[model samples]
Target: MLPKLVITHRVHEEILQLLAPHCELITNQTDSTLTREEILRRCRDAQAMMAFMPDRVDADFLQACPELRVIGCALKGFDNFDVDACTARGVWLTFVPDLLTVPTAELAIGLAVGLGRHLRAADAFVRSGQFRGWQPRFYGTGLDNATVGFLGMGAIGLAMADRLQGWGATLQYHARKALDTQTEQRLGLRQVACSELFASSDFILLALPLNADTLHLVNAELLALVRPGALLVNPCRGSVVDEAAVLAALERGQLGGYAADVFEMEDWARADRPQQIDPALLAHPNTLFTPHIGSAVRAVRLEIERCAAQNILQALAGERPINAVNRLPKAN
Candidate 1:
């Protein structure tokens, strides 16, 4: 009998066609999110499952689906999945970390330019029929000679640094550990303490992954250390920064501008309670937000889905997955 695979989100047609011959596919063709209960029901007998970012793959869900041997997450980040639970259960997990790196970095650069130049306000001014030529009212900062800081030096951060370097921006970065001299010199990155990175850079980009230490990494205390008139860009996870703290900073003029591609809560609009984000943040003239579309490019999305499908296919064949995040116990 063929292995059974369940897909919780809508996948590309090419992926479905690629995996159909190897497995019995159970898919959500409606292009809508599957509820927790629905996921538990459909994934019960599945040997492999493909999940989206919002679908929480926790201990209880893993325990309930005893037959599931593998999970392919169609995202770069895996905060939604409990890795410890999957490890304990001997379930293989995979994610597409490399595919979205460039796309997300490009979005970060765009957001930085938008915030620094006040592009949104300029566009509004044009639409309002108030285009007075040669006016100093729309003065903007240029990227040349600007000091740029990065909180993480992961793939996305490195990609962002490369682009910023081309624009003649000086680069500083903070990571748990420092990179080797040759690598740092090649990238032209100067490693600094977190406090210094906050105080020195004209633009700070948060490009770290979400983990225990990174949850609310940019809290009120850290926000207090930021240089006045500095622009902050986050193309990484939302939980890394405190929304309320950022809002407060914007109001106090401690931060010149803020741009984010992610949020603390994605479904805030539909929730019973009011949205967690302050309305003032949305109303702030220096703030810019995107619907977490850093990795939404068509080519990138297709490649990610293809990578995930390959992971599932490999696992179902009783082969070790190429991108498994956790290790399983050896057979006795």
Candidate 2:
């Protein structure tokens, strides 16, 4: 009998073909988000499973399905998975980090330019049929000679820096460690203190992961250091920034604009809760938001699915998976 592999959500047929020869695939054909109960129920008999960003893999779920050996997460961020629980149970966890780097970096740059130039407001004005004449008040800053600060300098951050180089943007960054001399010279990168990055840059972009240290890292105290007329762009996790603080900064004119692709709460939750985001922030003239589509491009999505599928195939064959986030004890 073939090993059973359950997919919690729909994936491309190309990914399905890759796994077909190795396992008996049990997939969600509906392409809808799976609930915790549905996952617990459907994944009970599987040896491995493919998980999406919204699927929470906790201790309880692992305990309920002791037969499960591995999980392949389709998304880059695996904050939703409980690493300790998976490790203790000897369950391998893998994710596709490389697939989204370039696409997400591109989105970050687009958001920065949009916020700096008031693209959303400009589009709104044109759509409202109010374009009578060109106005000097609508003018915006250019990326050339602008100091762009990066909160983290991982693959995505480095990619953003690479793109910004063409526009002649001055690059400053703060990461846990500094990069090598050769890389810094190639990218024209300058390392700076966190306080200095916040206070000096024309634009500050966040590309950090959401861990204990990064959760709410952009709170009131950090926002206080933001330079006047500086724009804030976040293509990282929404919880990384204090949404309430961001709204207040926009209102106070401490931040010139705020642009983001992620949010603290899911879109469905916002409809019922209403207060998930302040009305003022939603209505804020200087704010721009996208529905977490940084990695929504066609090629990137397919590559992500393929990477996750390959991880599952390898793990089931008793080989170590690429992009493994945790270590598990070896079986005798």
Best by lDDT: 1
lDDT per residue, candidate 1, 98-215, as tens digits? Answer: 9989999999999999999999988988999977687867687678999999999989988998887678888899999888899899889999999899988899999898877888
- Candidate no. 2 TM-score: 0.93
Q: How close is candidate 1 to the true structure, as a TM-score?
A: 0.94
Once all C-alphas are superposed, what RMSD does model 2 give against the true structure?
2.8
**All models: lDDT?**
0.86, 0.85
Q: Which candidate should be chosen as best, given TM-score against the real structure?
A: 1
lDDT of 2: 0.85
Query: What is candidate 2's lDDT per residue for 129-213, written digit by digit as tens?
Result: 9799878766876789999999999988999998987898899999998999999999999999988998899999998988778
Which 10 consecutive positions of candidate 1 have the poorest summed lDDT?
266-275
The collision pairs in model 1 are: none
Write down the TM-score of every candidate.
Answer: 0.94, 0.93
lDDT of 1: 0.86
